Every structure is written in structure tokens, then in C-alpha cells.
Write a protein that binds this ligand. Structure first.
Ligand SMILES: Nc1ncnc2c1ncn2[C@@H]1O[C@H](COP(=O)(O)OP(=O)(O)O)[C@@H](O)[C@H]1O
Length: 311
């Protein structure tokens, strides 16, 4: 209900919205498939949502898959051969395609031709289609794959004013009364993401209905977020454990990503793709050639003294 199904409802990414509206209206005007589109940025920013909007606005079907799911060239082939003219094939986590599966994608995208080995090479014609790929950052794709995308959109963390607009819109859809400052409190602590802002709104609604009067106020939002263990900066338990581990076990860094992951019992990709991007963006962590380091702001956040020493 609250997820935008069309570009008109896509708030907080004006450049992306304006560009996509233009490219889609142009492709439809020519009765052609939209050019292959790459969407990148952090998780929860609406990559899957945008992919679905593309299919919706184009008036076509969307087939969704993921880089890890396509273990063999034939798995990709099966999807490609099942598309109708103009359909969207959405491949989330596209940077995790195995090098050999990625090879099949090159002619499928560029020439609408399937070229697969079975030994014998088989060449088959494909109907026009749109590949929508998503990854956390564009630089982690090869140059050949990257260069086959005709449209490239970059999603960035949302500013707090736009997140508040999104929270207020969602509250309206849910029939909830919300004060401006209530929407602001949630937006402030939503970690720059509409996914999180919307989830937090649902949990705040619960608190309002059970412990309050049913409406969303700044005080109700604050108490509810405190119960959820989400702090004033939008940091959750894992975010704080990451920063505190860097401070306590590694003296603030520098610490290599593998050492940090092992110290947290978390995988590398989790720290790099899920935890770190917002923390770096907000100025709490910095990457250096010798490893990640916390900034003085990490110490200040926890009421700790800033150490003064040499590097
Ligand atoms: N521009 C936007 N405006 C309002 N809500 C959004 C926007 N982008 C995403 N959302 C919301 O955030 C959620 C996350 O979208 P999703 O496509 O799953 O992100 P990703 O695929 O990047 O992890 C969606 O369920 C949707 O409700």
C-alpha cells in the first residue's frame, strides 16, 4: 500500500524521477523497450521499488531474480527465453554474477542474442527486453557489463526533510494523525532510508495505539524509538556494537575489514554493504589504506573522551 507503484509517488530522488519519467515516456512513444538500466546505491533506498515502477510505467511484466540465484549459464538462458517483447528482467545484486554467467549477458543485452554453450555453441534470437540491474555501487561491476547499460541512476541516502514527507504520506495512507514534529522525529532516526522510515512508522503506530491516544506526536515517537533501541542518530544495536568494537578492541583503528568482521562474528559484505555506508556518510567512520578508523565523533557520540596520541 505504502510502496510507490508509479513515478508520481516517488519522493526524495528528484533527478532520478525526472530522468526516468522522460526516458520511459520516450520509449513508450516509440513502442520500444526501454534501454537497459543500472540502479545503484545502498540498501533500502528503493532499488527493487524503482525496478517495479519501471515495469509498471512501461506497461510490461517484470521477472525478478538475483546474481547468486543464477548459478549456471542455463539458468539465465531459461529466464531470457521466457520473456515477452518489452519485458523487464530485474537482476538484483548483479555484481555477484559468476564471471561465466555474466558472459552470456553481454550479447543478450547488446544484440538481443542468446549465445550459450551445451560441446556446442547455440545462438538464439531474443525478443527486445529491458535488463534492470541493481548493485550497492557501480565500481564493483566489470567495465564490459557496466558499459552495456544505456541508463544509469544513482540513489543516495535521503535527506531528513524528504523522509519526513514520506512518513507523513504513509501516515495519511494508513489513516493516522501525525504531528509535523512526529514525522520529523522518525525521519531523524530512519538511517537515511525510506524502508526504515516506513518500518519505524509502523512500530511507532503500535506504541501510539497501545500506550498513547492513537496519534503520532514527537514524544510518542521518541519513546517508541527508545523501546526499539534506535538512538538519536538512527543507530541500532549492531551499528553501536561496530563502533564500540573499533574503539575498544582496536583502539579506534586503523583496522582491516577482515579483522573487524572476525571480531564482530559478521561477514565482510555485511559490514561493507549494510553497516558502513551510512556511518561513513555521516562522519563516524573513515576508510584509509591501513584500514577503517572511527572519527572523533564516534567517541563523542558515546560520551567518551577523545584520545590524543600519534599515528
Ligand atoms: N522514493 C521513495 N518514496 C517513498 N517510499 C520509498 C521510496 N523508495 C523506496 N521506498 C520505500 O522503501 C522500501 C524499500 O524499497 P526497496 O526497493 O526494497 O529498496 P532496495 O531494493 O534498494 O533495498 C519500499 O518498500 C518502499 O515502500
Amino acid at each position: 500500500a505504502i510502496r510507490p507503484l508509479k513515478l508520481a509517488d516517488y519522493i526524495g530522488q528528484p533527478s532520478v524521477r525526472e530522468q526516468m519519467e522522460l526516458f520511459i515516456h520516450a520509449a513508450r512513444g516509440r513502442q520500444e523497450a526501454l534501454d537497459h538500466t543500472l540502479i545503484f546505491g545502498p540498501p533500502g533506498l528503493g532499488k527493487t521499488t524503482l525496478a517495479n515502477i519501471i515495469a509498471q510505467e512501461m506497461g510490461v511484466s517484470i521477472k525478478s531474480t538475483s546474481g547468486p540465484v543464477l548459478e549456471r549459464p542455463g539458468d539465465l538462458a531459461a529466464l531470457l527465453t521466457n520473456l515477452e517483447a518489452g519485458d523487464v528482467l530485474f537482476v538484483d545484486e548483479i555484481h555477484r554474477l559468476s564471471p561465466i554467467v555474466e558472459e552470456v549477458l553481454y550479447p543478450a543485452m547488446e544484440d538481443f542474442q542468446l549465445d550459450i554453450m551445451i560441446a556446442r555453441s547455440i545462438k538464439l534470437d531474443l525478443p527486445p527486453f529491458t535488463l534492470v540491474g541493481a548493485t550497492t555501487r557501480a565500481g564493483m561491476l566489470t567495465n564490459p557489463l557496466r558499459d552495456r547499460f544505456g541508463i544509469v541512476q544513482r540513489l543516495e541516502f535521503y535527506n531528513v526533510e524528504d523522509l519526513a514527507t514520506i512518513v507523513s504520506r504513509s501516515a495519511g495512507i494508513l489513516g493516522l494523525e501525525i504531528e509535523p514534529q512526529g514525522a520529523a522525529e522518525i525521519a531523524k532516526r530512519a538511517r537515511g532510508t525510506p524502508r526504515i522510515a516506513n518500518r519505524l512508522l509502523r512500530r511507532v503506530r503500535d506504541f501510539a495505539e497501545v500506550r498513547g491516544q492513537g496519534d503520532i506526536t514527537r514524544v510518542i515517537a521518541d519513546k517508541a524509538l527508545n523501546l526499539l533501541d534506535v538512538d538519536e542518530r538512527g543507530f541500532d544495536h549492531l551499528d553501536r556494537r561496530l563502533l564500540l568494537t573499533m574503539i575498544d578492541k582496536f583502539d579506534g583503528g586503523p583496522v582491516g575489514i577482515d579483522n573487524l568482521a572476525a571480531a564482530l562474528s559478521e561477514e565482510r559484505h555485511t559490514i561493507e554493504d549494510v553497516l558502513e555506508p551510512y556511518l561513513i556518510q555521516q562522519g563516524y567512520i573513515m576508510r584509509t589504506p591501513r584500514g577503517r578508523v572511527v572519527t572523533r565523533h564516534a567517541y563523542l557520540h558515546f560520551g567518551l573522551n577523545i584520545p590524543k596520541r600519534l599515528g
